[PDB]
């Protein structure tokens, strides 16, 4: 009879809890579970960040989980709590670039890429259409400035190529910025904001003839999130990330990789179990650092979401986005981005103003 190791998960529906209970099992069949054998403990999101974080303790740490998969708050409870103990957390659908900061979420892994990586496409796009002077409008928050960095880093290869206008999140009238942008006199414009905030830029730019011919509107995914298209200038270009919303498809592959890697861990001597309680324990789980090292160095082909590699920060190394052009009221897809290079669709781009 074998060692029983747990995997936790905070899951969006009770159904997903079953897809995860089963995933752990197909892994407990594909292995060969005689020394260690996995076991799946999971919760549903509690809506309150404290209720949530207590649960991580009582419902999941109590079961000595080696990792927790995640799907009024975002995963900050599951990360502040388990991250204390250094139990690796794996976010399945979290796109926010905040979680890519080692300083704040040091035991954190995610199967989707952060929004900031849309910059990669924004870059290779400019290379394709030889855009050498762009104006970058960014929410002055971590997510916006997150995007500003990755794009600017990308421009170092040879920051004069982008002029940057930031704005206070939640601002209502944005003409002041925009008229400053109109004085700055550029044709290409990259945006980083939320649905509600991009909406406001979308409006104020309509009041100033910045929605029309000559301009290009380059953009991410929240920026054409729902409710935001009613006001976005015709000829915008946005991005949606391929299969980035499938909590089920991601539960599949994560468990595969945690499984591969929980097994990977036991080739080592001097292995220790994470704490049982939260109560009483105020020292890191000793192996949890090494475990994190393992997951990161794990690569997985034939994963249902694609090949699951991991970069220096524990994001998904490569990612594909369906590029999107808005025309009249239909969001045609003029091309995909294959993680490396762009590939155009048969449909051609309809710029702002034909």
């Amino acid at each position: 009879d074998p060692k029983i190791v747990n995997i936790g998960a905070v899951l969006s529906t009770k159904k997903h809890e079953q897809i995860f209970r089963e995933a752990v099992n197909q892994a407990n069949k594909r292995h060969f579970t005689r020394k260690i054998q996995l076991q799946a403990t999971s919760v549903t999101h509690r809506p309150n960040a404290i209720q949530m974080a207590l649960s991580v303790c009582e419902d999941l740490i109590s079961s000595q989980v080696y990792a927790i998969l995640v799907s009024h708050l975002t995963p900050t409870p599951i990360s502040y709590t388990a991250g204390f103990y250094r139990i690796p957390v794996i976010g399945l659908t979290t796109r926010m670039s905040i979680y890519s900061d080692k300083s704040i979420h040091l035991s954190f892994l995610r199967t989707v890429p952060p929004y900031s990586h849309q910059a990669l496409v924004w870059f290779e796009m400019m290379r394709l259409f030889n855009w050498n002077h762009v104006i970058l409008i960014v929410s002055d928050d971590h997510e916006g400035r997150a995007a500003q960095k990755k794009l600017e880093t990308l421009l170092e290869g040879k920051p004069k190529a982008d002029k940057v206008l930031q704005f206070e999140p939640g601002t209502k009238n944005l003409t002041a910025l925009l008229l400053e942008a109109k004085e700055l006199e550029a044709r290409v414009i990259i945006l980083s904001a939320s649905e509600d905030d991009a909406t406001a830029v979308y409006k104020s730019a309509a009041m100033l003839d910045m929605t029309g011919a000559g301009y290009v509107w380059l953009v991410g995914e929240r920026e054409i999130s729902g409710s935001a298209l009613r006001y976005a200038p015709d000829g915008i270009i946005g991005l949606q990330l391929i299969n980035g919303k499938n909590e089920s498809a991601h539960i599949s592959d994560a468990v595969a990789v945690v499984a591969q890697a929980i097994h990977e861990l036991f080739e080592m001597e001097n292995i220790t179990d994470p704490p049982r309680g939260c109560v009483g324990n105020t020292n890191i789980w000793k192996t949890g650092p090494l475990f994190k090292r393992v997951l990161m160095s794990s690569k997985y082909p034939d994963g249902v979401t694609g090949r699951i590699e991991f970069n220096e920060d524990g994001d998904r190394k490569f990612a594909q986005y369906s590029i999107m052009n808005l025309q009249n009221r239909k969001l045609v897809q003029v091309g995909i981005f294959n993680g490396s290079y762009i590939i155009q669709n048969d449909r051609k781009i309809i710029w702002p103003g034909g």
Binding site: I50, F84, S103, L106, L290
Partner: protein, 352 residues
């Protein structure tokens, strides 16, 4: 006359210990044994839903820098002002949550770094090297020194910024390999006290903790001036919060003050005070705006004595900063004092 509850979670302290303003405080002291998340979270959540609390002074006698983080969490989430007087509950947490009402006794990382450069400004220790880990504030720290330098006629020379990753296995002695780069008289180290001790055992290993090299560190590293680790080098100059003249009970008084002056000012002008926290689980934006307001008072406070103002950022504006040194006997000795402007040091010629 109107009451305000003020819980005082005091973690391991066998001690004990004057106001004429509009709201009188109903203080209620409490101690706790554990400093883990569920333990800290659940204490404060009950002292509300039972005892109608309205703010928290919170002190411990530990180096658990993560206590600060758990308290910021609890504060933002309940829009209740939490004050971190002593211990890990007062090691500067660089970036706090937007909505948080949590303030700590002690200097900004930028303050300290400015102290540390004032210290080499004296003995002309102008050739140096920054070391960090990825603890919150490494960027702020390194940039703060880098910033003071770039525009000085003085001959600062910064030889290497080392950023050490401690979230990995350490099984490859890359950290060891990384410190090989280091070769400078003054090496500045930003990292936790638990993080500090490993950087030394490898520094002692590489002969960098040998004499001829000088390691300056911020408060958190020193931490508890009583506990002086084996792995710590003899002579690890540091800034620290001057408990020498500033007693623990002396703090808790000032904790009580700030919160109560804050409430007191607010009543004076707005003619109302936050209704006591309903429940840890009862979270509204019905309290977003009251909370935002009271923070404006929490941050601009004068007591019987001095100016106890904070910044919006969490740190303290004018703290009680003392420089210290680890002597031959493994003891911390006051070598210097940061007057509110210039610093008075003990030794003209540094102890050869």
């Amino acid at each position: 006359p109107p009451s305000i509850g003020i819980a005082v979670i005091l973690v391991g302290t066998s001690d004990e210990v004057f106001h004429h303003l509009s709201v009188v405080p109903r203080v209620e002291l409490v101690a706790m044994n554990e400093t883990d998340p569920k333990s800290i979270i659940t204490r404060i959540c009950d002292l509300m839903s039972d005892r109608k609390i309205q703010g928290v002074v919170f002190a411990d006698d530990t180096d658990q820098e993560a206590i600060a983080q758990i308290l910021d969490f609890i504060s933002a989430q309940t829009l209740t002002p939490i004050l971190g007087i002593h211990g890990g509950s007062s090691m500067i947490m660089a970036d706090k949550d937007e909505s948080s009402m949590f303030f700590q006794f002690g200097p900004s990382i930028e303050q300290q770094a400015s102290v540390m450069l004032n210290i080499m400004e004296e003995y002309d220790w102008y050739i140096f090297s920054i070391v960090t880990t990825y603890f919150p504030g490494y960027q702020d720290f390194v940039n703060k020194i880098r910033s003071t330098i770039e525009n000085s006629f003085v001959g600062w020379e910064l030889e290497e910024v080392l950023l050490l990753d401690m979230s990995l296995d350490d099984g490859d002695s890359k950290i060891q390999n990384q410190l090989k780069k280091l070769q400078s008289p003054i090496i500045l180290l930003y990292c936790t006290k638990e993080e500090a001790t490993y950087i030394f055992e490898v520094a002692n290993s590489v002969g960098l903790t040998g004499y001829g090299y000088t390691w300056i560190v911020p408060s958190l590293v020193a931490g508890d001036t009583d506990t002086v680790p084996s792995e710590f080098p003899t002579g690890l100059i540091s800034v620290s919060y001057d408990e020498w003249d500033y007693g623990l009970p002396a703090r808790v008084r000032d904790g009580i003050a700030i919160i109560t002056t804050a409430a007191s000012d607010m009543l004076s002008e707005h003619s109302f005070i936050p209704e006591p926290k309903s429940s840890c689980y009862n979270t509204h934006e019905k309290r977003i705006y009251q909370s935002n307001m009271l923070n404006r008072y929490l941050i601009n406070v004068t007591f019987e004595g001095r100016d106890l103002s904070f910044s919006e950022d969490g740190y303290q504006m004018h703290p009680k900063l003392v420089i210290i040194l680890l002597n031959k006997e493994r003891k911390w000795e006051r070598v210097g004092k940061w007057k509110d402007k210039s610093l008075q040091m003990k030794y003209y010629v540094w102890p050869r």
